[PDB]
Amino acid sequence: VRTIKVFTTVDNINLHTQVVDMSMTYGQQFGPTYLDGADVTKIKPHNSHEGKTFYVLPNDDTLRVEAFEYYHTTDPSFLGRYMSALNHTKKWKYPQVNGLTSIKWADNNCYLATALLTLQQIELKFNPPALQDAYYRARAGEAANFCALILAYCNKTVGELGDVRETMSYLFQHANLDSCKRVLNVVCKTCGQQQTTLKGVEAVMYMGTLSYEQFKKGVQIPCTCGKQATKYLVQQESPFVMMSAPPAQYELKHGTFTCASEYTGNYQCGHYKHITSKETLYCIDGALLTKSSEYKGPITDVFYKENSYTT
Ligand SMILES: [Cl-]
Ligand SMILES: [Cl-]
Ligand SMILES: [Cl-]
Ligand SMILES: [Zn+2]
């Protein structure tokens, strides 16, 4: 008898009119249902709910198409993981630190803070509208949705230990890096030499050394024959490159890199900070900011600006 009008959605843009019985739960009428992140599946409608938007799971073909077009995923648990994260990230704080949106420390989110600070310093466009829209809001300071999306895309829950390199890998997978190209040459004294071409995400990430100059000069790797072959960078076309390695004491010089991630800890427990090279070296640690003329610390990732390099 008693009803209210509400709207359901999967993208918070296209709304679907619903009339709900106030004597049954949302779950009985829609399946799993969320109100700005809060799980209301076992709740009966409130008068204050009239006219509000609820997220639901894509349970008919219209919602399936809308969800895929917005998120570029068909993982069945995606929307519930995104809402579950959002219920936490909407209570985090996003101070502006040295002109960049950061995140006040909470819930082991230090890896997200330094990923978010890095994105704001490299040229990158996302493909899913969900990330496009949310990143735009994050840049303006309202990063809760963007953080909850990163958690959902990376299959990490709030509180879980994250790795920055992994996280950037997922984000780059959803970015337009089609123009990026890398050419490598690997030289073995017994085996000869062999050139490789990498594209897309693989053309901007390297795991083994932090130094972009070292990568151009050559780095030693196993060869199949048993000896030490040498790999060096012969050509690069991309707006940035990311150089990563297991954390090691490393010296960062002002004006020689864009930004970097520092990791202190061990494989199951640690803390990331972000170092950015501007008019001096700034260390952003969530809401905290310090500066110094030189830097040395356990660095794990270094980002460098690029455009075209040929050897
Ligand atoms: Cl929708
Ligand atoms: Cl109320
Ligand atoms: Cl974007
Ligand atoms: Zn060899």
UniProtKB/Swiss-Prot annotation:
**Locate the Peptidase C16 domain: which residues?**
70-311
Write out the ranges of the repeats annotated as LRR: 116-138
The places in or outside the cell where this protein is found are: Host endoplasmic reticulum membrane
**Catalytic residue list:** C110, H271, D285
What does the annotation give as the result of altering K91N?
In strain: Beta/B.1.351
Q: What does the UniProt entry list as the effect of changing K231Q?
A: In strain: Gamma/P.1
Q: What is the effect of changing Y267 to G/T?
A: Reduced inhibition by GRL-0617
> Where would I find the C4-type zinc fingers in this protein?
188-225
Q: Please list the residues that bind Zn(2+) 6.
A: C188, C191, C223, C225
Instruction: Tell me what reaction this enzyme catalyses.
Output: Thiol-dependent hydrolysis of ester, thioester, amide, peptide and isopeptide bonds formed by the C-terminal Gly of ubiquitin (a 76-residue protein attached to proteins as an intracellular targeting signal)
UniProt topology in membrane = Multi-pass membrane protein
Regulation affecting activity: Inhibited in vitro by GRL-0617.
Q: What is the effect of changing F68A?
A: Partial loss of ISG15 cleavage in vitro
Assembly, in brief, is:
May form homohexamers. Interacts with N protein.
What is this protein's function per UniProt? Responsible for the cleavages located at the N-terminus of the replicase polyprotein. Participates together with nsp4 in the assembly of virally-induced cytoplasmic double-membrane vesicles necessary for viral replication. Antagonizes innate immune induction of type I interferon by blocking the phosphorylation, dimerization and subsequent nuclear translocation of host IRF3. Also prevents host NF-kappa-B signaling. In addition, PL-PRO possesses a deubiquitinating/deISGylating activity and processes both 'Lys-48'- and 'Lys-63'-linked polyubiquitin chains from cellular substrates.
What protein name applies here?
Answer: Papain-like protease nsp3
Its lineage reads: Viruses, Riboviria, Orthornavirae, Pisuviricota, Pisoniviricetes
Q: Covered range within the whole protein?
A: 1565 to 1875 of 7096
